[PDB]
């Protein structure tokens, strides 16, 4: 409803930025998110008011904004915003480990990636697959060699990034980059500015069926 207008016409551009007075480990992780996406730019958040940030970004004509929140170095939340009064999803992060912690094996690939979405079934699954795949560079080639996997595992989006290469006897893998267990917890039709827009969906923590169902 805000993506058929500019689905594969314009390639997006993404600004990735941290919460407020961030940690060094958080800024490393934000750099890793910038390297995860194509055509994204990490922007230093310090003394940036969120309203003048968000409308300066929308007059600069960017498409998406990804802020990040932390707790004692460990990153805990991110927020996808779409700018022409588009929706914001906001997710939490659970098992986050990074290549700056694990291995200094050189640089990443930065190629236009492929995308895999495992069992996004429901209508909320289609809405979140739209909000996740419309932040990637539109129409990659055939022999593009990094893929991203977003597997729904009981509302826990496992996110990994791999560089594959086809043999003739199969295809072997090398994962690299981040590793997420993210989960959706809010989604609203306004931008990040308002906290006044209509809640399209947020999870109910405190009903008496809070653990039985999937994509609550």
């Amino acid at each position: 409803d805000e993506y058929a207008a500019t689905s594969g016409i314009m390639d997006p551009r993404i600004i990735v930025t941290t919460s407020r007075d961030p940690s060094t480990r958080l800024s490393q992780f934000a750099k890793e998110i910038k390297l995860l996406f194509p055509n994204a730019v990490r922007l230093n958040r310090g003394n940036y008011v969120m309203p003048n940030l968000v409308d300066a970004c929308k007059k600069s004509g960017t498409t998406d904004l990804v802020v990040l929140h932390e707790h004692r170095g460990v990153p805990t939340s991110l927020t996808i915003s779409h700018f022409p009064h588009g929706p914001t999803a906001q997710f939490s992060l659970h098992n986050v480990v990074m290549r700056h912690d694990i291995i200094n094996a050189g640089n990443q690939s930065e190629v236009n990636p492929h995308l895999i979405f495992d069992n996004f079934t429901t209508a909320l699954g289609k809405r979140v697959v739209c909000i996740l795949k419309h932040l990637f560079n539109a129409g990659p080639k055939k022999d593009s060699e990094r893929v991203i996997t977003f597997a729904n595992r009981g509302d826990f989006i496992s996110v990994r990034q791999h560089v594959y290469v086809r043999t003739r006897e199969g295809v072997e893998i090398a994962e690299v980059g981040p590793r997420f267990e993210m989960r959706l917890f809010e989604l609203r039709l306004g931008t990040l500015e308002n906290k006044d827009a209509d809640v399209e969906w947020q999870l109910r923590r405190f009903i008496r069926t809070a653990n039985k169902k999937d994509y609550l």
Binding site: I102, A105, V163, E172, A174, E175
Partner: peptide
């Protein structure tokens, strides 16, 4: 590490962590 894994073809990082120097 694409060239290094291509060398591994023509000839798995995240299950081990590490630490700092001395």
């Amino acid at each position: 590490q694409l060239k290094n894994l291509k060398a591994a073809l023509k000839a798995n990082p995240f299950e081990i962590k590490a630490a700092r120097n001395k």
